[PDB]
Amino acid sequence: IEEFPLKISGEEESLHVFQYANRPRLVGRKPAEHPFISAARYKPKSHLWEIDIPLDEQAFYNKDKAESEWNGVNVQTLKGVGVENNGQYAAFVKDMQVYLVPIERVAQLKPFFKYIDDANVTRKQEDARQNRLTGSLLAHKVADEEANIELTWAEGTFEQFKDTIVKEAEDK
């Protein structure tokens, strides 16, 4: 009845889809949702992402300025470590051929905080003036060391569309 086409392409993408645990679904039973705001950060292979968003229109944060001890907040942060599954994909439709591109490391995120978290370890210097390796604590050791790649986006629409449509154009 309907001979929907269907091809697999994608080699150098390695696309990382997220999962924000902050905003709910059908706010007021109206399909008009998902705004998000500017630039983020990143950390190397333990991944522990550093996506963050700034503030918005007024909420009267003047009484409890700002984070914990009057530090001038302008951003809300969140972190998430990217342990990988297998089996799923990413895919979209040309009123015909879905594309089914691969789905490299994917996990969710948790709302990590700014100097609210750092106030207790800052107070320690403000007022008070076997095998030690792999197995129990190396994940909490090699995860706070250096910075890397991170950069803003550019809303790549035509280039990735071309890269998904050209490679799969041999079977038909």
Partner 1 sequence: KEAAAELELLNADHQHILRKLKKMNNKPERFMVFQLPTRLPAFERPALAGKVGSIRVHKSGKLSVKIGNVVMDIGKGAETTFLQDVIALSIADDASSAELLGRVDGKIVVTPQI
Partner 2 sequence: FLKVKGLVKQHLDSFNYFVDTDLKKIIKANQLILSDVDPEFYLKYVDIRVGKKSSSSTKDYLTPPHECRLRDMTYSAPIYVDIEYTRGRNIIMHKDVEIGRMPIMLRSNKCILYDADESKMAKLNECPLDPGGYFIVNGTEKVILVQEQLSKNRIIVEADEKKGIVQASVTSSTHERKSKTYVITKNGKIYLKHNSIAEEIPIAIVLKACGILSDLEIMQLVCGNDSSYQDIFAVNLEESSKLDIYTQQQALEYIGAKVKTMRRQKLTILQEGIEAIATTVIAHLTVEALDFREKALYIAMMTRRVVMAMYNPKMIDDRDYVGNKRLELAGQLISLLFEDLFKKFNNDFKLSIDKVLKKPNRAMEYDALLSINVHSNNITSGLNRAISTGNWSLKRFKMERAGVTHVLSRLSYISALGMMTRISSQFEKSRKVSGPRALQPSQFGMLCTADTPEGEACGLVKNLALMTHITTDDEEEPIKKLCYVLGVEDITLIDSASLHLNYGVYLNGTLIGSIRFPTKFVTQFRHLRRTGKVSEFISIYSNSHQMAVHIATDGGRICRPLIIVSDGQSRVKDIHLRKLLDGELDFDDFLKLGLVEYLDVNEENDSYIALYEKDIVPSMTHLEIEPFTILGAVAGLIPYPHHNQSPRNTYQCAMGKQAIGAIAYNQFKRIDTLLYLMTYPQQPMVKTKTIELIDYDKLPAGQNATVAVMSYSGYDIEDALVLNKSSIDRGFGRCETRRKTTTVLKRYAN
Partner 3 sequence: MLSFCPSCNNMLLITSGDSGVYTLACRSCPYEFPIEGIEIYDRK
Q: What residues make contact with partner 3 under the rule CB under 8 A?
A: 21-23, 56, 59-61, 63-64, 67-68, 76, 111, 113, 116
| Residues 43-82 contacting partner 1, CB under 8 A | none
Phi, psi for 80 (deg, rounded to 5) = -165, 130
| Residues 100-129 contacting partner 2, CB under 8 A | 106-108, 110-113, 116-118, 120-121
Pick the stretch among 8-16, 72-80, 124-132, 135-143 that binds partner 1 (CB under 8 A). Answer: 8-16
Of 3 and 57, which has the nearer Cβ to partner 1? 3
Residue 116 interacts with partner 1 (CB under 8 A): yes or no: no
CA–CA separation, 113 vs 76, rounded Å? 7
DSSP bridge pairs for 75 = 54
Q: Which residues contact 109 (CB under 8 A, 6 or more apart)?
A: 18, 19, 20, 21, 49, 51, 78, 79, 80
DSSP string, 50-73: B-EEE--S-----TT-SSSSS---
| Residues 46-85 contacting partner 2, CB under 8 A | 46, 48, 81, 83-85
Q: Which residues contact 65 (CB under 8 A, 6 or more apart)?
A: 72, 73
For residue 30, give the DSSP letter.
-
DSSP bridge pairs for 167 = none
Pick the stretch among 62-70, 71-79, 94-102, 116-124 that binds partner 1 (CB under 8 A). Answer: 94-102
**Smallest distance from the beta carbon of 96 to partner 2, in angstroms?**
26
- Interacting residues toward partner 2 by CB under 8 A: 19, 21, 46, 48, 81, 83-88, 106-108, 110-113, 116-118, 120-121, 130, 132, 134-141, 143
